[PDB]
Design a protein around this nucleic acid. Structure first.
Length: 16
RNA sequence: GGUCUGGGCGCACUUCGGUGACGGUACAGGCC
């Protein structure tokens, strides 16, 4: 969309 | 940052939708 900033916090939170 | 968001930016991917724990949680907001 770009990724929704919250969606950046979800990137690392998919993993950690 | 407990954590979620929002929508771009300055960059790289790609079906051009979204994917990217990159500058960077930085910006401004929710129960902090």
């Amino acid at each position: 969309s770009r990724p929704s900033g919250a969606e950046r916090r979800r990137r690392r939170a998919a993993a950690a």
